[PDB]
Amino acid sequence: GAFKIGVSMKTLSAPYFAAQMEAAKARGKELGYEVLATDAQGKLQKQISDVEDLVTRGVKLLIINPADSEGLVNAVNNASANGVKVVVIDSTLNPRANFVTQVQSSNSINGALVGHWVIEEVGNKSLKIALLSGEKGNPVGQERRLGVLSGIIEAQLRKFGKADLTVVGQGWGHWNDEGGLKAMEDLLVANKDINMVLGENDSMVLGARRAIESAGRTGILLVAAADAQKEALALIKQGKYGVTGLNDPALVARTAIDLGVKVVKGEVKDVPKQTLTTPAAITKGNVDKFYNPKAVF
Numbered sequence: 001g002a003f004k005i006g007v008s009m010k011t012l013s014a015p016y017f018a019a020q021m022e023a024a025k026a027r028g029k030e031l032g033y034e035v036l037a038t039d040a041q042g043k044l045q046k047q048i049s050d051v052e053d054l055v056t057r058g059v060k061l062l063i064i065n066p067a068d069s070e071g072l073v074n075a076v077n078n079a080s081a082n083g084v085k086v087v088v089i090d091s092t093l094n095p096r097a098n099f100v101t102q103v104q105s106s107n108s109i110n111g112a113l114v115g116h117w118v119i120e121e122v123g124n125k126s127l128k129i130a131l132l133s134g135e136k137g138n139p140v141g142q143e144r145r146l147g148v149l150s151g152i153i154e155a156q157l158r159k160f161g162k163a164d165l166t167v168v169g170q171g172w173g174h175w176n177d178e179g180g181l182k183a184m185e186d187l188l189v190a191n192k193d194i195n196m197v198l199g200e201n202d203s204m205v206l207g208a209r210r211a212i213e214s215a216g217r218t219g220i221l222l223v224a225a226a227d228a229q230k231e232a233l234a235l236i237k238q239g240k241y242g243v244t245g246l247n248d249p250a251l252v253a254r255t256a257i258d259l260g261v262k263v264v265k266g267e268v269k270d271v272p273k274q275t276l277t278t279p280a281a282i283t284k285g286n287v288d289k290f291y292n293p294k295a296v297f
């Protein structure tokens with residue numbers, strides 16, 4: 001029968017999130033369902049309230065991008081206990097919670113692929129890395145930075161029998177252009193020998209590139225662990241940005257909606273609790289497969 005789908009987003013305040021929300025809304029409608037959507041505006045307490053509201057409004061399927069991996073456990077457990085099928089998207093929820101599956105980008109494997117590529121590109125070069133991180137305490141952010149850095153190390157070990165790297169500083173850019181720009185400004189003042197920027201998303205790296213260009217600082221390789229944002233892809237095609245990792249907000253949403261509807265309908269069972277989208281490192285070689293200048297994101 002007809003049932004309602006709820007989509008609870010932690011925030012809509014970066015391009016990825018806006019695109020993900022619209023894709024989720026669109027896919028539920030395409031499949032023939034009413035979609036009720038909420039934006040927590042970056043506030044955990046509001047997201048808890050949003051979930052509770054969607055459950056009493058009668059959603060049978062809840063798609064949630066959680067503001068905190070721990071703080072939403074009780075609300076998700078209660079939704080599931082009241083018969084809602086819950087699919088977590090993008091941000092991690094503690095896997096001890098009761099939900100159907102977590103759909104997200106393959107962050108650890110992307111990081112490995114991206115770090116391996118860096119060594120394919122620069123070889124033995126002594127790396128002096130400025131790190132742009134998203135949000136303190138974010139486990140996806142941590143998986144991305146440590147995935148890329150450990151990928152660099154592993155690739156060096158395999159090729160050279162030894163490894164070395166230096167992270168000259170870390171700034172926090174809150175997943176957006178302005179945040180990346182400001183963090184990079186600080187990093188540039190602090191450090192005169194940077195030869196690589198590592199970002200936990202493209203939006204921050206794109207803002208950082210503007211600080212780099214304003215400062216006239218040359219020789220810096222741009223590396224992102226996520227998401228394949230179109231503006232980054234365009235620069236990768238031009239040779240002005242090194243690599244990114246694949247995290248398609250619309251694919252994540254569609255995957256979650258399709259699987260969730262199948263679960264509600266009894267068409268699928270014994271779903272794995274982790275559902276990772278295809279990993280990829282995207283570079284000048286393969287960018288043409290992925291780049292659409294007219295894309296949403």
Ligand SMILES: OC[C@@H](O)[C@H](O)[C@H](O)[C@H](O)CO
Nearest residue numbers: 016090091140175201226227
């Ligand atoms: O552009 C945002 C994107 O990288 C997203 O996957 C993350 O910010 C994630 O939501 C962090 O949990």
